[PDB]
Design an enzyme around this catalytic site. Structure first.
Site, PDB file in Angstrom:
ATOM      1  N   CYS A 165       2.209  -0.831  -5.252  1.00  8.30           N
ATOM      2  CA  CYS A 165       1.585  -1.530  -4.124  1.00  8.30           C
ATOM      3  C   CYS A 165       2.533  -2.505  -3.426  1.00  8.30           C
ATOM      4  CB  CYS A 165       0.332  -2.258  -4.557  1.00  8.30           C
ATOM      5  SG  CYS A 165       0.678  -3.419  -5.852  1.00  8.30           S
ATOM      6  N   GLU A 207       1.330   2.611   5.263  1.00  8.11           N
ATOM      7  CA  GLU A 207       1.809   2.608   3.884  1.00  8.11           C
ATOM      8  C   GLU A 207       1.858   4.032   3.325  1.00  8.11           C
ATOM      9  OE1 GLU A 207      -0.959   0.945   1.022  1.00  8.11           O
ATOM     10  OE2 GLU A 207       0.643   0.158  -0.254  1.00  8.11           O
ATOM     11  N   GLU A 216      -7.311  -6.465  -3.586  1.00  9.26           N
ATOM     12  CA  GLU A 216      -5.889  -6.196  -3.347  1.00  9.26           C
ATOM     13  C   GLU A 216      -5.810  -4.829  -2.690  1.00  9.26           C
ATOM     14  OE1 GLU A 216      -2.434  -4.621  -5.670  1.00  9.26           O
ATOM     15  OE2 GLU A 216      -2.855  -4.159  -3.581  1.00  9.26           O
ATOM     16  N   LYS A 233     -13.864   0.628 -14.141  1.00 12.58           N
ATOM     17  CA  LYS A 233     -13.865   1.907 -13.445  1.00 12.58           C
ATOM     18  C   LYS A 233     -12.402   2.285 -13.209  1.00 12.58           C
ATOM     19  CE  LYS A 233     -14.835   5.539 -11.080  1.00 12.58           C
ATOM     20  NZ  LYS A 233     -13.511   5.853 -10.463  1.00 12.58           N
TER      21      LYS A 233
END
Lengths: 498, 498, 498, 498
Positions: A303, A400, A269, A193
């Protein structure tokens, strides 16, 4: 014969599949439903892409199940599985300029960077894991003997079966490659996906699996809605493992759905708020270069980007001055232009969030040194940003950004444990860094940082052989390295008496 | 001075703690709430045991957190952690008769078996993992070099932090030992939830940790309600990992709670319906002995018990006749008596479930060859039971009894793939077994069985060095062996440029 | 441009280098000294080959030293070393028919076999070891801490440096590939001594290293006298490791020379007298096929060939009858003819030894069932041979023939330990095998056989992932598998205090 | 009853065996031949010790062979072998003061040091390797399948058999322990040759193996002449491995003898000329303390002692001044005096060599700063010695002293590669060290040093988990760590077709 979206750009003629990829063929979704993928350089529609429905997810899982249980993939030697993955990497390399161009169009990745990193590392990933196939080994174990009889105990590493993997939009092909390579090297089959906003390199990749001769159904790709496809994969009785990289809240839901269906294995993650601690005894000009990279690399859509810089009081002002000097030299522009240093953000909604993020940084009292705004030009460009006077309680000290926003706090000369405490205050734990010439500080700081990766006098130095994964609420499980394989294998213990 | 319940029994004086164990001390629960623990040999109350409340769970987690972050356990050398765990094993050995006697009283474990297995294997477990402490090693990894500079990449194996472990009632001390030894060997601290019905050996174990000099707060034990304590541990923001062995529905909930709180790591062992395939070319008398043990060991309260026996047509009737002859020779009675070889079931509710299970077996058309009823004496004794004519669609072919109930199906002479399909037609995948003298059949069957452990010409042959864990809906993660350590470690990648 | 010997043969135009290969170039030996290489199919001179002198050995070692210390090979990433070795395998594959033809001419290898085995396995070897380059990893080790300070201990796997490798004549390219691939994968540089009688595929291989882009001086090849080149390599102060496969007496001398010079590392594989034990409960027709292969594969010029067959009394006579029927069907002929399945022996001196061996077998009282003689035709063909009534004291029960000579002894029905004692009563310990359908016998026999490899219900099943090496006077050290790398690496321990 | 030499000393009544130890009993040598062992503190004869003859070596090897092939050691579980080795460590600990006293008497080891290091590390060694016994594991390997059939390939780790080990005189019990523990943990049996000059702790250790219940013949000890016993062990047809630590010339001979007999395995540790590089950016007072220890530890009788110190020009004179100041504070005296810093040299002949060594250093032009002579007092005491103005061509820059002689050369300010070249210009390669606060220098220097161990900001920091062994003419093979086990194991590959 595959249907393509054709496009003459970057001195190539791109041929882009746009449909679902199920059982070795490109097919429309149920009801021929589609959605638009948007070019972030100018906001234009690149093309319509198939919008996977629940019935399509079921078809993909069924194809992967058949490929695993009855197809050639489950029958061939480990060594020959490796050969096919090495061929796949070769095919990717043959198409590297095309893939890098598609990634520039779809994700805003600067072409030179997309060649070297997004695509270059993807090729390394498949070659690395191809090498593991015939080197995955179990054990023989010296157990107590059932005297007067004898015992032999061994373990066999086996594939887990059908896996579902959910890929983020920051490095679409590269993140796909990380998970897919380890998954396939371990003998599994997969339903992938890709992020709704970045389907195109995944679909070109699907075509390349055909060219490489990967058996039908081993790889299936379902562009569309993340909630729809991710949910159904996580619920599916025939899926045995989910690998997920994305937002904390979606990841939590994914893990819950894994539990409530068939207790499938899961890896997560979930991003980070990664600290970079810069001591006065570092090499300053190098700290400026690497500190900038830590934040601005791939327009901050990274990330492991450093989400806070802690800079020792005595060099703070000079550091900021040098960063500003260097920021001013960055060339913002079309990712296909060779002189471009800084490309557009991935999509419009993300750009809007970055604008709101910096508004809030200013509201709550941080010092805006430069940037913080959308660049005045078409598309979704954001000005490289520097904040100073950031305090621990501030929103921008905790949240973040996933954008090119350097967030700087001072620490007192000589204050090692105190700055470590502030760096570790976060519930995230993905990455971290320290710049210092002092070996004692470097080793102590790396011990004490509560993060899955610690960079020392560098940043963003990932490698296909070095495991990558988070601690705390950044998740668990590793991509890359030998360790990645364990997420995609199961261990059978076989015990004989003779 | 610790409060004990004292009891003269089995040629010794038992001194049994009965309170919560938090931060190195035995303490009442909030409100001094208690519940009765029951002796399954006669239905009597052994004593009142503290009933942990939510505030007590929080106190235990806080003690474990402090012990890990600031106490001696997080400071000492790995080798010295090993020494303490080896000392703990020595203390357990010095108390082996006492521990085995408590297990006989609290769980109905036959004393001779408790001494060898429940306690004996626990001591082996601690000695085994004690040896691992200074042998847990990371890696140095040959990553690509950022020329003209150099790079060094290494991994550190670090503890995960505060762990919560939930222990079933089948082998109370032994299952506690499996998880606790690996957890502690990896440098973690722990909060342990023993089954409500079997608290006593866990609490005596806690006292033994004091005798061994395990620092305060490294081990905390919370008897009480499984829903209360397990839920709070799985929700708690300072807990970083749960290890759970128990029922499927509780396990699924635990994993959901791990997800929704702080994405803590989880391992699950959720039982099985383990097939044992007995071929006509086996050693038949040996097959009868081992087949009986596969079912009847520890009164069937055994997560890897053979839940179905598939017996080849040509030997089926002779096999059943021999089993019946041997069942008649079993001595059912007080587990403290040396002649006893079949003890009572663990608790009354379980006995009532076994009675109902066999009623359903008869109702749905299986042939009750022997047993099926409560033994008419004090306590919760159940007859060793044999069913034949069991068909694949039957409830007793699908459901785990956790009792001494041998459930036999035929398969046609010469069939191999056909019986494998039937054996694999469970969503469980914990263990399995095959009896045959034919090397080719044995190896092929072991390949094809979809289970975490495959026994060949033996059964129940676990070993502290051999990893144990399930596939499919039996869960994931290993106890025992080197592999168990990975559930309790995290990997930090450290990458230098120089 | 390279000087070639050109030959039109096997529908190809062979281009064979014939000179020394030093520092990336083909050069004459000192004084342009040469020797003749002989075609064993007809005894004709194929061509003159350079005859390496002591000064040439020194030049080769100097070239390897420079390539290691200062050249590209010592500087590039492990991953990129891997890429070069993969590329080399690809080039070998592109030349597979030519290489296999050269091996047919030079060694008498049947072309169909040379293609599949000699060349095919060589290609597999390079691809396998290419995969290891970036997967060779050291450790991080939890040592005791020098409190109040901290310690970090790691290990780094490093190349050993310049290696000398001495290659036997039985599978010239294949044995070269085994050692060279592991040596190069570990980052070393090499001087290769192919057997005097089989230089040609080594020299073509050297040319292929140029095609593959292996840096100059990484591979150097010195055809000529074994005593001259082997002695100088083993004496040389800049060589750090010797890998030797060959005769026991030469091996012992090599090891002695390693000792007296600079204590360079050494590995030795010194042949075998490998027992194959065939039980009455085996699959008899399969035992005949695999027993045939165990002896006759590659005209018996196979270090793991079964040098004794022990056959259970009850099936002995039938086994021998079936063997004789199969032996009679073997087509002896030119290795380039497609229906040939038994080619000529490697060289005249070997043929002479085989004749003397069978004379002695007859002299000492064994029953010669068939063969034993040179085939009446040009070249060095030897008739497939079967001896029975072989007693343990006999020369042919002790000495390795290295030819197509099946050497059969009986053992009493039901004996197992007795036949094991006889099978183990050699000072060799390279390989062994057992044929039986009984799992218990198979596992017990495999435990008890004193040999580096044990085959169960097969023979000659080597694999590039499976380590191969002997025990006792067969030597030490492994070729193939992860284990082979250890011979070509050193471990540096680095210990920090901070 | 065992015959003892009894001595009232150090508050103890020492009971010292003095005879050969063969098959679990203390026995005179052939002809009752003896030699004197000398106390280096006063030159007195401690006692007469048996002088092993060739027939005695054969008796010892025979006992070891029987113990391995037929005795309990070869039959018990790996876990139970571990238990015995742990018990041996416990017995050593119970006798630690006695052992340390014997070492003070026999070797001149300072008592406080003998307790912590000589004996303390020996105890750690046995406990460490005891833990490995049940954790030595082979592999299961994914080889290519012989379709339509299947293959299983596994490896078994097995003992090598009878080992001979030759122990040096610098740390008699400790070096014995290093080798013996790994050897025994791997399941071997052993004949131990302690140095002629230091037999007594080995013989007391032998008695302790009886107390620990090590089966008779597993450990045999042969004091006497090194040439006699070492030669016969290296020649013996039933010995399968030699582990040797000692002089280069003897080691070369041992390896030659291994070759010419039965190609038994060999490991060699042949001492060093280890460089310590001290940069101006180090912590100077700590560098003085650690630099002094690098040379003077255990009176310099230390195979990894720093044999050259390279000190950066700008700190050289201050470094030397500080060293001289601290050398003057060293307390030289009887090993039993609790404030002794520096004990006597091991034996008289070594003392005489040290005197000559320093005479040569002065004659060739080095500057003697302090020491250089025997301390005038009874026994064999040598003054801690410092040389400066040492140049690379000098004898004392090349030759290992094995005494307390600090050998100092300047290197140029700001230079790194030049000093590395000088440090690497020995044919030895055992250890090395670097003192610097600069992380970049530390990492680069540790890469470039051609030695088996590199210490960073420490020295002499060995650990039972950290492998120790040399490169180049220092030998090969490791003691300590997991790596040590590989010298004492063989790998059997077992390949099934089914």
């Amino acid at each position: 014969v595959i249907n393509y979206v054709e496009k003459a750009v970057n001195k190539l003629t791109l041929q882009m599949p746009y449909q679902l990829f199920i059982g070795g063929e490109f097919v429309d979704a149920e009801g021929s439903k589609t959605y638009n993928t948007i070019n972030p350089t100018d906001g234009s529609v690149i093309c319509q892409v198939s919008l996977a429905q629940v019935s399509d997810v079921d078809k993909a899982v069924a194809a992967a199940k058949e490929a695993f249980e009855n197809g050639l993939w489950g029958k061939i030697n480990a060594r020959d599985r490796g050969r096919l993955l090495y061929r796949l990497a070769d095919v990717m390399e043959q198409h590297q300029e095309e893939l890098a161009t598609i990634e520039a169009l779809d994700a805003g990745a600067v072409y030179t960077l997309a060649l070297k990193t997004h695509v270059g590392m993807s090729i390394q990933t498949f070659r690395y894991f191809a090498g593991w196939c015939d080197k995955i080994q179990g054990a023989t174990i010296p157990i107590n003997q059932a005297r007067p009889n004898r015992n032999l105990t061994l373990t066999k590493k086996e594939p887990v079966g059908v896996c579902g993997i959910v890929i983020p939009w920051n490095y679409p092909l590269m993140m796909l490659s990380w998970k897919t390579a380890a998954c396939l090297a371990a003998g599994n089959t997969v339903v992938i996906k890709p992020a709704q906003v970045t389907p195109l390199t995944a679909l070109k990749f699907a075509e390349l699996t055909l060219k490489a001769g990967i058996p039908k159904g081993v790889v299936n790709i379902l562009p569309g809605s993340g909630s729809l496809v991710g949910q159904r994969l996580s619920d599916h009785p025939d899926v045995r493992k989910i690998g997920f990289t994305g937002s904390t809240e979606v990841g939590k839901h994914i893990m819950k759905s894994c539990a409530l269906s068939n207790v499938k294995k899961v890896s997560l993650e979930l991003g980070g708020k990664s600290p970079l601690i810069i001591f006065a005894d570092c090499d300053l000009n190098k700290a400026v270069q690497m500190g900038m990279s830590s934040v601005f690399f791939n327009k901050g859509e990274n990330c492991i980007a450093a989400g806070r810089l802690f800079v020792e009081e005595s060099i703070h002002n000079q550091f900021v001055q040098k960063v500003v000097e260097e920021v001013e030299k960055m060339k913002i522009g079309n990712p296909l232009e060779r002189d471009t240093n800084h490309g557009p953000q991935n999509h419009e909604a993300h750009l809007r969030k970055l604008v709101e993020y910096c508004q809030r940084g200013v509201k709550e009292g941080a010092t805006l040194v430069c940037g913080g705004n959308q660049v005045p030009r078409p598309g979704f460009f954001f000005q490289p940003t520097v904040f100073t006077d950031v305090e621990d309680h501030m929103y921008i000290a905790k949240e973040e950004s996933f954008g090119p926003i350097m967030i700087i706090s001072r620490f007192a000369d000589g204050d090692v444990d105190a700055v470590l405490s502030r760096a570790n205050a976060t519930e995230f734990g993905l990455a971290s860094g320290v710049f210092t010439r002092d070996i004692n500080k470097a080793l102590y700081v790396s011990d004490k940082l509560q993060a899955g990766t610690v960079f020392i006098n560098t940043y963003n130095k990932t490698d296909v052989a070095a495991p990558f994964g988070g601690f705390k609420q950044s998740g668990f499980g590793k991509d890359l390295g030998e360790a990645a394989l364990n997420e995609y294998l199961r261990i059978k213990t076989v015990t004989f008496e003779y």
